[PDB]
Design a protein around this ligand. Structure first.
Ligand SMILES: *C(=O)N1C[C@H](NOS(=O)(=O)O)CC[C@H]1C(N)=O
Ligand SMILES: *C(=O)N1C[C@H](NOS(=O)(=O)O)CC[C@H]1C(N)=O
Ligand SMILES: [Cl-]
Ligand SMILES: [Cl-]
Ligand SMILES: [Cl-]
Lengths: 233, 242
């Protein structure tokens, strides 16, 4: 079922980094990773939690649709793109914590907890202190892709639209980045999938990310693994 | 409201070409074109008809969802990518005429006509073969009418389900990066003169949407890439895309 291909470690050491990439070939129901241990370690979800939070906000009506505006509160924060109005699409694009904090307040602790349980999300059992492994990310995302989660079809299609990250004639990537900072080890996340004409390859990676300047490596290393496996040109 | 910008013709003449680009700025409700007259001239929809066709097929249940497979019928056709199975996503990507001619037959004349009137689509005339009227029948639509139709799709205001509308917009996905998303559909009218090339859709920005529609004289297939290239040259000139 799962195969460990340590040759991928080269793409982490090339950039003097340590981390994991987990791939899942949907057609063949086979998985691949460079590090079976780290594939199954649970790290803090950080921004990748915006995926279940979006779904829950939509299904409960807290977010009416992807065009609804969420006004900046006029408090300047360190990330300039946050200091403006947003809709669901822009808020995911720029990973706008204060907007998603608001969704969570309105959702409330009790319903948030009931729905993450319906989703079987994270390792924890019952980022709001949610730990989740890369392989657990894939399993959650496979449910999203197939519209199997316990929310409406509409909520799931809207979130998949908001995860749109890249598209050309060769592939479509839906995905979400994350950077976990408040507890060592500081790590970057990138989770999602790449759509091809007649297959889907799910992915989930995280990597030690001590500073901040390395954050591009999250996509870059993931793509080197995809190119090595001829999943993308 | 409407403004003519003739400077855009340089992009056509530099390719020895004639055509029109129309742009609609959604926030400001203003339009821009190099040729008001040709913007309002109605042509055969050709493969741009796959948008309304997809919507109707989905709403009527002819297409269950974007994963349903339409097996190739064994008949080897000229375009190699047509000679294989498809779903709605791939069928739109490769503009797979025979899949859509099957849709049209299942839809039938009456429901196709009724729907196009509900859509207020072009001249709403399906006269001819039900599975080719958009290629060599009576249907006619202008660039400004494509935009008007696309804007109704963009706001989920067509008289079909929201779901139908969301699935079709997924299948129109063409390009996406950190700067913009293009949802569009190409066309090439080839059977009835004047031969023209189409490209219609929109550019999603963070805080605005620019709808577009261009057609251009297309004597030969050698120039088909110009549809996108001229449109992007206009978009770059107007600082819509880098
Ligand atoms: C998510 O983990 N966060 C929100 C924001 N950007 O996340 S992303 O670029 O990795 O997608 C900043 C970092 C981080 C946070 N401050 O909690
Ligand atoms: C649509 O106008 N057509 C279908 C097919 N797609 O070419 S496209 O790249 O312009 O969409 C070939 C051209 C044309 C046709 N001959 O039916
Ligand atoms: Cl929104
Ligand atoms: Cl999409
Ligand atoms: Cl429907």
């Amino acid at each position: 079922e799962w195969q460990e291909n340590k040759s991928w470690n080269a793409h982490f050491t090339e950039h003097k980094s340590q981390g994991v990439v987990v791939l899942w070939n949907e057609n063949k129901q086979q998985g691949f990773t460079n590090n079976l241990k780290r594939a199954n370690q649970a790290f803090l979800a950080a921004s990748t939690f915006k995926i279940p939070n979006s779904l829950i906000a939509l299904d409960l009506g807290v977010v009416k649709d992807e065009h609804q505006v969420f006004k900046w509160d006029g408090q300047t924060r360190d990330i300039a793109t946050w200091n403006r109005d947003h809709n669901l699409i822009t808020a995911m694009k720029y990973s706008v914590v204060p907007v998603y904090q608001e969704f969570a307040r309105q959702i409330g602790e009790a319903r948030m907890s009931k729905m993450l349980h319906a989703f079987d999300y994270g390792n924890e059992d019952i980022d709001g202190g949610i730990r989740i492994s890369a392989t657990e990310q894939i399993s959650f995302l496979r449910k999203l892709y197939h519209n199997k989660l316990h929310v409406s079809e509409r909520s799931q299609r809207i979130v998949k639209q908001a995860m749109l990250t890249e598209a050309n004639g060769d592939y479509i990537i839906r995905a979400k980045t994350g950077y976990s900072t408040r507890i060592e080890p500081k790590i970057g996340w990138w989770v999602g999938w790449v759509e091809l004409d007649d297959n889907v390859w799910f992915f989930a990676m995280n990597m030690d990310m001590p500073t901040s300047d390395g954050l591009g490596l999250r996509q870059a290393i993931t793509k080197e693994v995809l190119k090595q496996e001829k999943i993308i040109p």
